[PDB]
């Protein structure tokens, strides 16, 4: 993440991929489901 609203709010869970945090587990687990679908990046080698 670059910069959001929350600043002094520690969450119980955290994403190791980017750093996204959520209140519940299942809430985060899904946030990782997108880290796979769009994982294979690379349109061209310039
Ligand atoms: Zn993430």
UniProtKB/Swiss-Prot annotation:
Chain intervals annotated as zinc finger (C2H2-type): 13-35
Say which domain of life the source belongs to.
Eukaryota
> Where in the cell?
Nucleus
- The disulfide bridges present are none
Role of this protein: May be involved in transcriptional regulation.
Family that this chain belongs to? Belongs to the krueppel C2H2-type zinc-finger protein family.
Protein name per the record: Zinc finger protein with KRAB and SCAN domains 5
Which part of the entire sequence is included in the shown chain?
Answer: 628 to 660 of 839
